[PDB]
């Protein structure tokens, strides 16, 4: 059968194509969210068959309710126990296959659905088209992307096809416990839908619209409305039963968390269906006839019924990239169906259109729900084809000249998009495994990670941890990796928890990294009890603007972190303009916006760009390898030679600038540093070498050894200096300069000479007060306890 060919094309696309992106230096799950499923499944396996509904290990120190549904958590736990892969690489490997299998198995609900609406010829082209559609639906259905989005699609389509299947038989009255199986199944698919995704109750209004229209159009649409209703009664009843055990895991009403709201929706829907059943009974008996409403009686009762329900609730080429030609060939199918039932007038066909339009109406312009169109574009293309085909069945091979216009360029994109997989890069993954091993209390974190936390009534106040804990602060993107790989507790989440802001002084990631002095940062860090900071080159460069926007509240305020551009004039002179409007026409402009003076004062710049130089309470403890392009350059470029580094960077920039693309991030950092030295570095300001650095850097928040004592006028400032060497055998200078008060000075130093960290100082501190210079060595305990040290100068 043709249901084995596409099934192989789908395996080829989802398991085979990205195989080496998933099975590399580690087993590497995609994106961020699959790492959190992983976190949940591991914990659920341990506490089987119980699972948590709140996670104090994330959104530190408040904790996060878990909206991720039980379907995938249990599916993955069950898979794990079955293959006795309960943690680590083995678990991940198993979990990696789950979305691929889910995406291959999507053949079944699609075939079923487009068979139940149309015929078999269409249902086969259908199963083939869904096996090759591209876009979000494929990207989230690939090896390693173990997330619930494939299952939203799978159970939604399943729910439709199984529901329509339960309307194509229950007719008349044969019902019995063999015919009862058909709606019970459909109720299960709905149940599983909501259990995959909490917002999935939305399928309930959709199906109820099927009944609404089958009633108010009982004129020119036939349907066994009594059985259509009875089936819905059973279906919605069953779905509610399946949902029921999970209804009470969130303290309130929610459309996303597992709350009794969803239960109300499914029970209410069962009641509505029963009202419809009764409406039909009154119709059939002649009640509307006797009260003199005639044939308008029933639709009016329906109009009124919904009004009340409404009442007591009242109070483009992207498309080609995302669907290929299945977009067009699915768009024609819509219209053809919008005309055909507009002539032949059937119920299943009407149901499908309603589903499609509701999809369109609700998910228009919302890129995050694109995957829902996949099944739509596959069914209405299998129809558009299973119509052109049945027109011509040398004509009998023009059928192939459009059946190639469809299948061909959408296998192409599907093959080209299926060959790369995402997830953390090696620098990040190694940094976090390092963190797990080299920061304190690892054993406790490992035990606690596996505990069945109780669900609390609120998370507005700091959670009460069962032990002495600390937080790890980084941009919110990285939260799932930090938790799943480092087994440490991130301040911020890919659910967008813990971002905070500056305008309302809410301590969080954005208010830490865009903080314009160390004191404010310290305020934020103290509130969130942070002990480690993790910063990456993306935070330093491309994502910096995003942190500014969140911190400030809007786009124009964030723009104060940026200046102009470097360029070459048409006479070939190098220049900087604070604004592009100062740039002579016909210049070549490096399409990289240079940060303003303000940027260089932010924590993100002090940490990632200046390697923590100037700061009192932070020290680098580890960095990863370089960004790829600079690792690659270094085989011909000496990274200790500023001139060669800079000339390489500018060349790359100008080169890319004519393709209109911006430099690689490592080059951007080199240019940022160059800009600083040329525009903003003051007479005695913090110096920085023009050189690349580790993609990922880890810092420790630290009290700092207090060095203090007396000077001798005219000395108005005391400076401290030390050379630091990273585990990548890169050096930079730590500097701090302190203003004198009443013939005395005070300085807080964060580096010690006996810490077990791979980033260490290689000289003692050289203090300098005017003419007198000294040479201090600091010990870890002095730094850890904030001991005071007397030194006369
Ligand atoms: Zn997701």
Q: Residue 635: give its domain's CATH number.
A: 1.20.58.1650
Residues 56 and 153 in one domain: yes
Tokens of 503: 């305008």
User: Of the residues 606, 624, 642, which one is the last residue of a structural domain?
Assistant: 624
Q: Residue 718: give its domain's CATH number.
A: 2.60.40.3390
Distance 32 CA to ligand 1 centre (A): 8
Q: Residue 514: give its domain's CATH number.
A: 3.40.50.12610
With tokens 């087993």, the residue in question is 27
Distance 351 CA to ligand 1 centre (A): 28
| SS3 annotation, 64-99 | EECCCCHHHHHHHHHHHHHCCCCCHHHHHHHHHHHH
With tokens 């396996």, the residue in question is 45
| Neighbouring residues of 331: CB distance < 8 A, sequence distance ≥ 6 | 380
Distance 209 CA to ligand 1 centre (A): 28
Enclosing H/E stretch for 720: strand 717-725
Residue 782 sits in which domain range? 705-792
The total number of structural domains in the chain stands at 4
Binding residues for Mn(2+): 33, 147, 149
Distance 790 CA to ligand 1 centre (A): 55
Distance 334 CA to ligand 1 centre (A): 29
Distance CA 767, CA 705 (A): 14
Residues 440 and 466 in one domain: yes
**Residue 781 CB-density burial (10 A; 0-12 exposed, 13-18 middle, 19+ buried):** exposed
With tokens 């540093």, the residue in question is 673
Distance 202 CA to ligand 1 centre (A): 18
Instruction: Give the number of other Cβ atoms within 10 Å of residue 434's Cβ.
Output: 19
Residues 97 and 3 in one domain: yes
Distance 38 CA to ligand 1 centre (A): 13
SS3 call for 786:
coil
C-alpha distances in Å from residue 637, one per residue of 630, 641, 675: 9, 8, 21
Residue 51 placed within a domain: yes
Residue 45 placed within a domain: yes
Among candidates 229, 186, 196, which has minimal Cα distance to 102?
Answer: 196
Distance CA 755, CA 724 (A): 13
Distance 475 CA to ligand 1 centre (A): 18
| Under 8 Å between Cβ of 749 and 765 | yes
Tell whether the torsion through CA atoms of 469, 474, 480 and 486 is positive or negative: negative
List gaps in the chain by the residue before each (C–N > 2.5 Å).
174, 315, 393
- Using left for φ > 0, alpha for ψ between -120 and 50, and beta otherwise, residue 100 falls in alpha
Distance CA 658, CA 652 (A): 11
Distance CA 472, CA 357 (A): 45
Residue 285 placed within a domain: yes
Distance 143 CA to ligand 1 centre (A): 15
Among candidates 435, 464, 460, which has minimal Cα distance to 448?
Answer: 464
C-alpha distances in Å from residue 475, one per residue of 487, 498, 540, 552, 612: 17, 9, 11, 15, 17
Tokens of 301: 């009762």
Residue 437 placed within a domain: yes
Residue 114 CA neighbour count, 13 Å, CB half = 32
Please tell me the experimental approach by which this structure was elucidated: X-ray
Distance 789 CA to ligand 1 centre (A): 52
Contacts 24+ apart (CB under 8 A), 159-162: 159/186, 159/189, 159/190, 159/193, 159/203, 159/207, 160/109, 160/113, 160/351, 160/352, 160/355, 161/109, 161/110, 161/112, 161/113, 161/114, 161/115, 161/116, 162/109, 162/112, 162/186, 162/189
Distance 332 CA to ligand 1 centre (A): 31
**Residue 614 CB-density burial (10 A; 0-12 exposed, 13-18 middle, 19+ buried):** middle
C-alpha distances in Å from residue 457, one per residue of 131, 253, 264, 461, 582: 44, 13, 21, 11, 58
Phi–psi pair at 570, nearest 5 degrees: -65, -20
Distance 166 CA to ligand 1 centre (A): 31
Q: For 506, which DSSP code?
A: B
| Neighbouring residues of 367: CB distance < 8 A, sequence distance ≥ 6 | 136
Distance 83 CA to ligand 1 centre (A): 25
Distance CA 332, CA 688 (A): 61
Residues 460 and 576 in one domain: no
Residue 700 placed within a domain: no
| SS3 annotation, 355-411 | HHHHHHHHCCCCHHHCHHHHHHHHHHHHHHHHHHHHHCCCCCCCHHHHHHHHHHHHH
User: Of the residues 670, 695, 720, which one is the last residue of a structural domain?
Assistant: 695
Residues 165 and 206 in one domain: yes
| SS3 annotation, 256-273 | CCCCHHHHHHHHHHHHHH
Distance CA 662, CA 521 (A): 31
User: Of the residues 418, 447, 479, which one is the last residue of a structural domain?
Assistant: 418
Q: Which residues in 279-303 are b (16+ Cβ under 10 Å) and which e?
A: bbebbeeeebeeeeeeeebbbebbe
Distance 260 CA to ligand 1 centre (A): 23
Distance 607 CA to ligand 1 centre (A): 30
Tokens of 486: 């480092």
Distance CA 541, CA 563 (A): 14
Residues 310 and 239 in one domain: yes
Phi–psi pair at 79, nearest 5 degrees: -55, -45
Distance 503 CA to ligand 1 centre (A): 29
Among candidates 22, 36, 24, 28, which has minimal Cα distance to 476?
Answer: 36
| Under 8 Å between Cβ of 155 and 200 | yes
Distance CA 232, CA 268 (A): 11
Residues 716 and 638 in one domain: no
Residues 407 and 444 in one domain: no
| Under 8 Å between Cβ of 687 and 606 | no
**Residue 157 CB-density burial (10 A; 0-12 exposed, 13-18 middle, 19+ buried):** buried
Distance 664 CA to ligand 1 centre (A): 27
Residue 182 placed within a domain: yes
Distance 413 CA to ligand 1 centre (A): 22
Residues 614 and 504 in one domain: yes
Phi–psi pair at 617, nearest 5 degrees: -115, 15
Residues 555 and 591 in one domain: no
Any alpha helices (H) in 197-296, and if so which ranges? 203-216, 225-243, 260-285, 287-290
With tokens 């083939």, the residue in question is 128
| Under 8 Å between Cβ of 614 and 573 | no
Residues 714 and 787 in one domain: yes
Distance 153 CA to ligand 1 centre (A): 13
Binding residues: 33, 67, 147-149, 368
Residue 712 CA neighbour count, 13 Å, CB half = 8
Binding residues for a glycophospholipid: 67, 148, 368
Longest dimension (CA), the chain: 111
Distance CA 243, CA 70 (A): 10
Chain CA centroid to CA 538, Å: 16
Residues 412 and 442 in one domain: no
C-alpha distances in Å from residue 497, one per residue of 57, 65, 508, 525: 12, 11, 9, 16
């Amino acid at each position: 059968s043709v249901l084995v060919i596409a099934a192989l094309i789908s395996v080829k696309l989802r398991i085979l194509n990205p195989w080496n992106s998933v099975f590399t230096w580690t087993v590497r799950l995609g994106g961020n969210d699959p790492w959190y499923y992983y976190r949940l499944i591991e914990n659920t396996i341990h506490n089987f068959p119980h699972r948590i509904w709140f996670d104090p290990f994330t959104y530190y120190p408040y904790g996060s309710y878990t909206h991720f549904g039980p379907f995938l958590v249990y599916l993955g736990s069950i898979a794990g126990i079955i293959f006795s892969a309960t943690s680590g690489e083995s678990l991940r490997a198993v979990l990696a296959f789950i979305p691929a299998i889910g995406g291959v198995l999507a053949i079944l609900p699609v075939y079923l659905l487009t068979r139940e609406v149309f015929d078999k010829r269409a249902a086969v082209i259908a199963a083939f088209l869904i096996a090759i559609v591209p876009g979000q639906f494929l990207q989230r259905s690939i090896l390693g992307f173990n997330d619930h989005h494939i299952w939203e699609a799978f159970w939604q389509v399943s729910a439709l096809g199984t529901f329509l299947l339960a309307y194509n038989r229950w007719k008349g009255h044969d019902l019995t416990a063999r015919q009862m199986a058909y709606p019970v199944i459909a109720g299960i698919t709905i149940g599983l839908y909501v259990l995959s995704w909490g917002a999935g109750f939305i399928i309930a209004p959709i199906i109820l619209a099927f009944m609404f229209f089958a009633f108010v159009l009982a004129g020119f649409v036939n349907a066994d409305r009594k059985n259509l209703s009875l089936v819905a009664v059973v279906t919605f009843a069953v779905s509610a039963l399946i949902y029921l055990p999970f209804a009470f895991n969130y303290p309130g009403f929610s459309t996303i968390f597992y709350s009794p709201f969803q239960l109300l929706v499914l029970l209410g829907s069962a009641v509505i269906a029963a009202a419809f059943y009764q409406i039909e009974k009154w119709n059939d008996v002649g009640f509307f006839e006797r009260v003199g409403l005639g044939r308008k009686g029933m639709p009016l009762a329906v109009i009124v019924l919904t009004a009340l329900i409404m009442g007591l609730f009242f109070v483009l080429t992207n498309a080609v990239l995302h669907f290929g030609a299945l977009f067009f060939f699915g768009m024609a199918g819509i219209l053809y169906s919008a005309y055909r039932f507009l002539k032949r007038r059937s119920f299943p066909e009407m149901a499908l259109l309603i589903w499609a339009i509701a999809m369109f109406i609700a998910l228009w312009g919302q890129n995050r729900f694109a995957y829902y169109f996949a099944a739509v574009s596959a069914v209405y293309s299998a129809l558009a084809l299973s119509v052109v085909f049945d027109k011509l069945h040398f004509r009998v091979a023009f059928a192939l000249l459009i059946a190639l216009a469809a299948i061909y360029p959408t296998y192409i994109l599907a093959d080209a998009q299926s060959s790369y997989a995402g997830g953390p890069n090696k620098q990040w993954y190694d940094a976090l495994t390092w963190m797990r091993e080299n920061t304190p209390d690892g054993e406790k974190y490992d035990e606690y990670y596996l505990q069945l936390y109780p669900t609390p009534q609120s998370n507005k106040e700091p959670f009460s941890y069962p032990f002495e804990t600390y937080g790890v602060i980084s941009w919110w993107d990285y939260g799932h990796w930090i938790e799943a790989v480092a087994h440490r507790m991130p301040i911020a989440n890919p659910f967008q928890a813990g971002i905070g802001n500056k305008y309302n002084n809410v301590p969080g990631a954005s208010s830490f990294f865009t903080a314009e002095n160390e004191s404010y940062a310290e305020f934020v860090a103290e509130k969130l009890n942070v002990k480690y900071v993790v910063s990456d080159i993306e935070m330093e460069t491309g994502k910096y603007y995003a942190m500014a926007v969140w911190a400030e509240g809007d786009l124009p305020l964030a723009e104060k972190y940026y200046g102009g551009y470097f360029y070459y004039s048409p006479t070939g002179t190098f220049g900087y303009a604070n604004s592009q409007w100062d740039i002579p026409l016909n210049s070549i402009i490096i399409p990289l916006r240079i940060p303003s003076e303000l940027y260089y004062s932010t924590m993100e710049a002090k940490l990632h760009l200046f390697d923590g130089s100037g700061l009192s309470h932070y020290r680098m403890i580890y960095e990863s390898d370089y960004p790829a392009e600079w690792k690659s350059y270094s085989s011909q470029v000496n990274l200790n030679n500023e001139s060669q580094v800079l000339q390489t960077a500018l060349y790359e920039a100008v080169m890319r600038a004519r393709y209109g693309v911006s430099p690689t991030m490592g080059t951007q950092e080199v240019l940022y540093k160059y800009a600083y030295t040329q525009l903003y570095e003051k007479k005695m300001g913090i110096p920085v070498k023009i050189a690349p650095s580790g993609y990922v850097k880890i810092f420790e928040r630290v009290k700092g050894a207090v060095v203090t004592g007396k000077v001798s006028a005219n000395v108005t400032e005391v400076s401290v200096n030390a050379t630091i060497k990273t585990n990548q055998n890169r050096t930079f200078e730590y500097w701090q300069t302190v203003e004198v008060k009443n013939g005395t000075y005070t300085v807080v130093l964060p580096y010690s000479h006996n810490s077990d960290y791979p980033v260490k100082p290689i000289t003692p501190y050289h203090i300098k007060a005017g003419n007198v210079v000294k040479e201090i060595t600091i010990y870890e305990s002095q730094v850890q306890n904030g001991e005071i040290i007397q030194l006369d100068l």
